[PDB]
Design a protein around this ligand. Structure first.
Ligand SMILES: CC(C)(C)c1nc2c3ccc(F)cc3c3c(=O)[nH]ccc3c2[nH]1
Length: 286
């Protein structure tokens, strides 16, 4: 059953973040009056046809998802001037792990709990026959209780019923498995590769000097898209991998490497990752 927010009662507070197709801002929704704080995401200015269709897909997908570790869809708002809907979501005031981790002292057990929660949301997503396609620390958000909420479903897709992959502008190539780069196939297992990269980001505390783009660009250089993807594919097929983060346990690095098996069918499922991460979280907790 639909929920409609009325622009007449939305009062902008501040900007929060920029995703693939939309910008997110904080609003007070006050049909009285104070009222509820909500996040509102709107189609970016100068959006072309391809962007409007991506944006429509994002709203359609998020409208169907309902889980403790997926950012909560609240409703939509019409913007008649844009001829487009605006997406209203819960407000999660700690923002993304990309912005949070560099600014706080966080232990290994906490990082592994974040990872477990990411796997729980992703196991749910895959249950529902969607792939995310940009599973990266920038898109993992934290609520006031530091509970993980996966966000930015801008690239997400329904995997055609009867299949284990979706056949695929600017892609987040430094988070992508070789089959995505080379075969233009995005499997459920391709999101698991991306999770491995995200886990690497968590263990490096989202330090920019250690980031996946920094590490790969050191080897590939700035180049055109096609050349970048070719060079990246070659490195990955030859077994090149992101290094073990300082202070990362051997078994946690082995977990990353398993998520980065070149052959997709050898990677763990998100369902299996849940108890694996639970186990290592408890181990390093006490
Ligand atoms: C970059 C991206 C599109 C993933 C994004 N950033 C935020 C965000 C950043 C800081 C903050 F305090 C809140 C949010 C936020 C939010 O509160 N709700 C929904 C999405 C979202 C968000 N979505």
């Amino acid at each position: 059953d639909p929920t409609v927010f009325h622009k007449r009662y939305l009062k902008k507070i501040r900007d929060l973040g920029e995703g693939h197709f939309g910008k997110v801002s904080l609003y007070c929704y006050d049909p009285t009056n104070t009222g509820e704080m909500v996040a509102v995401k709107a189609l970016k200015a100068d959006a072309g046809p391809q962007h409007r269709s991506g944006w429509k897909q994002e709203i359609d997908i998020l409208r169907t998802l309902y889980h403790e570790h997926i950012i909560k869809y609240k409703g939509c708002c019409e913007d008649a001037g844009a001829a487009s809907l605006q997406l209203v979501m819960e407000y999660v005031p700690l923002g993304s792990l990309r912005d949070y981790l560099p600014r706080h002292s966080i232990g290994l057990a906490q990082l592994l709990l974040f990872a477990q929660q990411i796997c729980e949301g992703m196991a749910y997503l895959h249950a529902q026959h969607y792939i995310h396609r940009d599973l990266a620390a920038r898109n993992v958000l934290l609520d006031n209780d530091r509970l993980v909420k996966i966000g930015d479903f801008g690239l997400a897709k329904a995997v055609p019923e009867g299949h284990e992959y979706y056949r695929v502008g600017d892609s987040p190539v430094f988070w992508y498995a070789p089959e995505c780069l080379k075969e233009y196939k995005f499997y459920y297992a391709s999101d698991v590769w991306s999770f491995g990269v995200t886990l690497y980001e968590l263990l490096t505390h989202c330090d920019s000097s250690q980031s996946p783009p920094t590490k790969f660009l050191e080897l590939i250089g700035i180049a055109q898209g096609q050349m970048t993807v070719l060079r990246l594919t070659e490195l990955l097929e030859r077994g090149e991998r992101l290094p073990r983060p300082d202070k990362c346990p051997a078994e946690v690095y082995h977990l990353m490497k398993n998520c980065w098996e070149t052959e997709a069918s050898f990677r763990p499922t998100f369902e299996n990752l849940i108890p694996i991460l639970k186990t290592v979280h408890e181990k390093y907790q006490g």
